[PDB]
Amino acid sequence: LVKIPGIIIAASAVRAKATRISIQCRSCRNTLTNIAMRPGLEGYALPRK
Amino acid sequence: HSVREWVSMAGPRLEIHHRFKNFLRTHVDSHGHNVFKERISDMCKENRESLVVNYEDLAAREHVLAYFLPEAPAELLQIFDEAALEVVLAMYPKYDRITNHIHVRISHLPLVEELRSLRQLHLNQLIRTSGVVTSCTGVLPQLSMVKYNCNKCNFVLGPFCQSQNQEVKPGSCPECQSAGPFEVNMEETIYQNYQRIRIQESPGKVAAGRLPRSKDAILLADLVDSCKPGDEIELTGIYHNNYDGSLNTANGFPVFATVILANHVAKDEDVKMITSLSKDQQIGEKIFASIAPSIYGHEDIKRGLALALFGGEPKNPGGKHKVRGDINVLLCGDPGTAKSQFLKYIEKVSSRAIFTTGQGASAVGLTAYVQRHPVSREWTLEAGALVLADRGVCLIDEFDKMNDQDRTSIHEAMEQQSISISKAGIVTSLQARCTVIAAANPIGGRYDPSLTFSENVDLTEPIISRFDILCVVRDTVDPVQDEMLARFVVGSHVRHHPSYGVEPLPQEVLKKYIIYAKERVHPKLNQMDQDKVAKMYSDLRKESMATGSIPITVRHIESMIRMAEAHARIHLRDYVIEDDVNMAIRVMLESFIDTQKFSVMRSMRKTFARYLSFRRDNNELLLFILKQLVAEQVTYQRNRFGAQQDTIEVPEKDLVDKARQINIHNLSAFYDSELFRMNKFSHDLKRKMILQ
DNA sequence: GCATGCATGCGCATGCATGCATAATGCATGCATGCGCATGCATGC
Ligand SMILES: Nc1ncnc2c1ncn2[C@@H]1O[C@H](COP(=O)(O)OP(=O)(O)OP(=O)(O)O)[C@@H](O)[C@H]1O
Ligand SMILES: [Mg+2]
Ligand SMILES: [Zn+2]
Ligand SMILES: [Zn+2]
């Protein structure tokens, strides 16, 4: 944890980021629900089976 | 076999490790002291991580390691690091808690060729180069001892050492046997300092007809931020190819790109001395004569620049009435008077000074703007030279050539002492507490004594009103002064081929005195004399109105006070006395009178001779009278005869009469003065005459 | 009626056709923007 002063020169637009996702299967239409995403700039890899 | 092949095997590795440990333990200086003892002790006193080794001593003690060093740098450096770590941990046991590794760096070497000669023969070798830094990437966290999290289970894979050549790709998760994917455990990973530098040949060493060439280098761990862009450095490094992506494959010939990996870079009593110098009664004249050693004459300009450098003290009762303490300086001169040399000297001396020119293509602009930097390719807010010089000096050359935007920004920064920006969605106000020194030329190319200062200069009255001190440098043909100036110029040219003040202070001593006076001297006005100031102000305004042009105003008095403070800062006085007030009065009166035209200037100079004669020299005034008479006689001779005569003579009676008019009755000391001999004057009693 | 023959019957091994289980990485494309150039419009004097 750090504390730092500065001056702001650029600010991007407000966008949307997901924290809980749900995915569906092609054939049997089963679902995996309430998968928790990680905070910050981190992605997620879908399962294959 | 190759050197690195023999290095790789374990036997000679352990033998060399033992040899290096013994070299570390047993190495002593020429005087018998243990060098590594004191070195590691002073390293321990500051918890450092790096150790420096000389190639000369290494070759003297153990020759085989020195011989193998150039052609196998990485493994040998690793072995030496292990040996040094073992020895240090033997000396002290706490570093296992503080630092788990210690780097070894080579300091001296037989100098290696420049950037031009590096070719295929130098690959994977140890080299030493010299160059000029042009850019830096900053500080970056590189990986080391990486821990990975499996994405099917949540197992944490063990630490993996990150080599500089290839990325680390874990094979499979030891528990669930999955082939991937994996991500980096941010919390348990260890990180290292990384920086990248571009180096260009020094422009002075490049032969005519070819261009300088550049190369890239990488600094790690303690080497980061050890160089500033624009500096000249020397590196010891490894000329490398074996990094992924060096081979050109997509199109074109099979060309490799080379990179250098560096491991070394080669570029109390003073307070008592300051107090002792302050104890000297003539420190002020020493400081005045200490400015601009290389410029002849213009003593008044140097005296003014002294106050400008030392400065004053801002005052703001509450948050209502702000009064600055920065003394601005303006110079107006005919060509060839060396106005720019003063600015160059001031930039050299000043701790924080910015230089810019109004003609165009300046290295530093005079207006703030937001832009993508051409080099770093980043979106930056570049403020003008005025903002960058906080509590510093800003120098502007070619003051008249400035366009509209520069004039507007300068006016705003001088009158409000802040710069406002509204650009690209950014609205800011920035502080511009800086002292402004400027130089300029007259409108017609030559100063006209029959016109006021404002009529002679392209600038406007509001801009001129801001400056506390105005100096006018007019070129006039004086044979003795021209002879002396030519002598100095020719002497400077001859010296630099490749094959009143008792003593000026040293430049470093002057810098230290300036810093100490600015930090710890705050003169107080608790002993001012308001009666004399009020009477003099009233009389000045009265006679200004009597002449009928350019009346004085209250602002000048403020400048005087500031100058007084500056003088009190010179002697380290904590209180203001009458001497500083009188000197500031003289300076302000000279500046005010010099801006008037001929008749008004003459009348004011004659009437105010009382105040302007404070701490003056009578001999200088007599020399001025003699010069005026000589000039009159020479002008008459040239106009009537059409040519000059071989000798110049003047009766003593006229000089005596004029001295009596200035209330001076004795001139023998003037005859015996050094000023009389310096101008090659002689006095003959056989004819009561003065000859030149 | 007692001695003998024997067609029926049951449980565990191997052989062979079908059937079942597994399972991330590298390369390509369009959007944003710098840098050099020539035309052209508008503004002074
Ligand atoms: N008093 C002096 N002492 C030493 N050198 C001098 C002196 N007066 C003039 N010079 C020399 O005269 C030359 C004129 O160049 P310089 O840049 O100093 O001129 P400048 O006054 O700034 O002129 P400009 O008005 O054209 O900007 C310089 O090389 C400078 O060294
Ligand atoms: Mg100049
Ligand atoms: Zn399914
Ligand atoms: Zn796993």
XYZ file of N, CA, C and O (backbone and C1' of nucleotides) in Angstrom, chain C residues 3-38:
252
model
P -25.107 -102.912 -5.720
O -24.478 -102.728 -7.178
C -24.269 -103.864 -8.008
C -24.031 -103.445 -9.447
C -22.976 -102.353 -9.634
O -22.069 -102.723 -10.664
C -25.012 -101.721 -10.684
P -20.772 -101.822 -10.964
O -21.179 -100.996 -12.270
C -21.516 -101.690 -13.461
C -22.126 -100.751 -14.485
C -21.268 -99.535 -14.846
O -20.828 -99.649 -16.199
C -23.582 -98.964 -14.547
P -20.109 -98.421 -16.947
O -21.311 -97.680 -17.690
C -22.223 -98.437 -18.478
C -22.977 -97.552 -19.459
C -22.165 -96.435 -20.090
O -22.630 -96.200 -21.409
C -23.860 -95.514 -18.677
P -21.947 -95.071 -22.323
O -22.835 -93.774 -22.039
C -24.255 -93.873 -22.023
C -24.871 -92.531 -21.691
C -24.013 -91.333 -22.093
O -24.802 -90.365 -22.772
C -24.606 -91.178 -19.809
P -24.392 -89.896 -24.253
O -25.517 -88.833 -24.655
C -26.873 -89.239 -24.780
C -27.796 -88.319 -23.996
C -27.680 -86.831 -24.325
O -28.954 -86.211 -24.133
C -27.175 -87.142 -22.080
P -29.234 -84.711 -24.641
O -29.665 -83.928 -23.310
C -28.804 -83.927 -22.180
C -29.426 -83.193 -21.010
C -29.290 -81.685 -21.064
O -30.281 -81.083 -20.246
C -27.857 -82.547 -19.393
P -30.408 -79.484 -20.173
O -29.348 -79.063 -19.051
C -29.476 -79.573 -17.732
C -28.398 -79.010 -16.825
C -27.977 -77.569 -17.131
O -28.361 -76.715 -16.060
C -26.106 -78.978 -16.649
P -28.094 -75.133 -16.145
O -26.734 -74.928 -15.323
C -26.675 -75.295 -13.951
C -25.265 -75.154 -13.401
C -24.645 -73.756 -13.523
O -24.015 -73.406 -12.293
C -23.178 -75.359 -14.395
P -23.954 -71.874 -11.817
O -22.404 -71.489 -11.943
C -21.543 -71.644 -10.820
C -20.080 -71.614 -11.236
C -19.531 -70.240 -11.639
O -18.212 -70.085 -11.118
C -19.138 -71.767 -13.357
P -17.581 -68.621 -10.920
O -16.290 -68.619 -11.870
C -15.072 -69.245 -11.445
C -14.014 -69.165 -12.535
C -13.655 -67.742 -12.974
O -12.241 -67.594 -13.308
C -14.468 -68.932 -14.811
P -11.206 -68.832 -13.351
O -9.846 -68.165 -13.884
C -9.884 -67.092 -14.842
C -9.569 -67.585 -16.249
C -9.314 -66.479 -17.271
O -7.911 -66.331 -17.485
C -10.962 -68.048 -18.091
P -7.341 -65.078 -18.318
O -7.595 -65.466 -19.854
C -6.894 -66.561 -20.445
C -7.327 -66.780 -21.889
C -6.968 -65.651 -22.856
O -6.527 -66.190 -24.100
C -9.304 -66.012 -22.887
P -5.842 -65.236 -25.199
O -7.006 -64.969 -26.264
C -7.458 -66.027 -27.102
C -8.449 -65.527 -28.143
C -8.040 -64.262 -28.889
O -8.486 -64.348 -30.235
C -10.069 -63.875 -27.756
P -7.992 -63.282 -31.328
O -9.291 -62.392 -31.601
C -10.518 -63.020 -31.945
C -11.647 -62.007 -32.007
C -11.293 -60.679 -32.678
O -12.395 -60.230 -33.445
C -12.117 -60.267 -30.532
P -12.355 -60.297 -35.048
O -13.702 -59.557 -35.487
C -13.815 -58.149 -35.332
C -15.070 -57.782 -34.562
C -15.546 -56.352 -34.776
O -16.962 -56.303 -34.765
C -15.008 -56.662 -32.494
P -17.742 -55.431 -35.864
O -18.442 -54.278 -35.010
C -17.648 -53.395 -34.236
C -18.361 -53.019 -32.954
C -18.685 -51.541 -32.817
O -19.874 -51.375 -32.064
C -17.116 -52.163 -31.153
P -20.583 -49.936 -31.988
O -19.996 -49.299 -30.647
C -20.174 -49.975 -29.416
C -19.309 -49.365 -28.330
C -19.382 -47.837 -28.219
O -19.780 -47.471 -26.907
C -17.140 -48.598 -28.169
P -19.998 -45.927 -26.524
O -18.680 -45.552 -25.705
C -18.340 -46.292 -24.541
C -17.129 -45.695 -23.846
C -17.157 -44.180 -23.675
O -16.606 -43.836 -22.416
C -15.243 -44.795 -24.902
P -16.840 -42.373 -21.799
O -15.369 -41.755 -21.721
C -14.329 -42.487 -21.091
C -13.004 -41.750 -21.191
C -13.097 -40.231 -21.162
O -11.979 -39.707 -20.464
C -12.106 -40.917 -23.194
P -11.963 -38.185 -19.951
O -10.503 -37.682 -20.353
C -9.874 -38.210 -21.513
C -8.688 -37.360 -21.912
C -8.944 -35.868 -21.875
O -7.729 -35.170 -21.656
C -8.750 -36.598 -24.134
P -7.734 -33.810 -20.799
O -6.415 -33.038 -21.276
C -5.811 -33.351 -22.527
C -6.149 -32.308 -23.584
C -6.835 -31.032 -23.064
O -6.128 -29.864 -23.498
C -7.988 -31.916 -24.928
P -5.831 -28.673 -22.461
O -6.130 -27.329 -23.275
C -5.538 -26.097 -22.866
C -4.285 -25.815 -23.675
C -3.584 -24.503 -23.360
O -2.194 -24.635 -23.641
C -4.424 -24.423 -25.558
P -1.166 -23.447 -23.304
O -0.697 -22.936 -24.745
C -0.121 -23.855 -25.667
C -0.066 -23.270 -27.068
C 0.604 -21.900 -27.176
O 1.860 -22.033 -27.827
C -1.370 -22.075 -28.538
P 2.866 -20.784 -27.917
O 2.647 -20.228 -29.398
C 2.788 -21.102 -30.508
C 2.052 -20.560 -31.718
C 2.564 -19.210 -32.236
O 2.993 -19.334 -33.587
C 0.190 -19.240 -32.080
P 3.707 -18.097 -34.325
O 2.529 -17.419 -35.172
C 1.969 -18.113 -36.278
C 0.744 -17.393 -36.817
C 1.011 -16.022 -37.448
O 0.348 -15.938 -38.705
C -0.721 -15.867 -35.864
P 0.598 -14.688 -39.685
O -0.830 -13.971 -39.755
C -1.986 -14.731 -40.093
C -3.250 -13.889 -40.003
C -3.183 -12.531 -40.697
O -4.424 -12.263 -41.330
C -3.721 -12.224 -38.427
P -4.556 -11.058 -42.380
O -5.509 -10.008 -41.636
C -6.783 -10.423 -41.156
C -7.517 -9.276 -40.481
C -7.367 -7.917 -41.159
O -8.598 -7.215 -41.088
C -6.640 -7.759 -38.933
P -8.980 -6.122 -42.201
O -9.590 -4.914 -41.348
C -10.683 -5.149 -40.470
C -10.619 -4.230 -39.263
C -10.559 -2.737 -39.585
O -11.362 -2.015 -38.663
C -8.714 -3.328 -38.259
P -11.852 -0.523 -39.003
O -11.390 0.329 -37.731
C -11.906 0.016 -36.445
C -11.062 0.645 -35.352
C -10.873 2.158 -35.467
O -10.968 2.758 -34.178
C -8.768 1.098 -35.410
P -11.184 4.344 -34.028
O -10.026 4.787 -33.020
C -8.691 4.388 -33.276
C -7.707 5.207 -32.467
C -7.668 6.682 -32.814
O -7.105 7.421 -31.740
C -5.786 5.552 -33.746
P -6.911 9.011 -31.869
O -5.419 9.173 -32.419
C -4.324 8.761 -31.616
C -3.015 8.877 -32.377
C -2.751 10.246 -33.023
O -1.419 10.669 -32.742
C -2.461 8.533 -34.600
P -0.993 12.209 -32.919
O 0.492 12.130 -33.506
C 1.531 11.529 -32.741
C 2.673 11.061 -33.631
C 3.399 12.158 -34.400
O 4.762 11.796 -34.584
C 2.330 10.709 -35.926
P 5.882 12.932 -34.774
O 6.090 13.005 -36.357
C 6.753 11.946 -37.036
C 6.739 12.172 -38.537
C 7.101 13.591 -38.984
O 7.964 13.539 -40.114
C 5.016 12.981 -39.880
P 8.959 14.760 -40.434
O 8.721 15.051 -41.989
C 9.035 14.056 -42.955
C 8.206 14.243 -44.213
C 8.308 15.628 -44.854
O 8.623 15.502 -46.237
C 6.023 15.025 -44.507
P 9.048 16.793 -47.095
O 7.753 17.104 -47.978
C 7.174 16.076 -48.775
C 5.789 16.480 -49.245
C 5.698 17.900 -49.790
O 5.510 17.860 -51.195
C 3.853 17.362 -48.325
P 6.186 18.973 -52.134
O 4.936 19.659 -52.849
C 3.944 18.848 -53.452
C 2.565 19.441 -53.241
C 2.425 20.907 -53.648
O 1.730 20.996 -54.887
C 1.266 20.377 -51.599
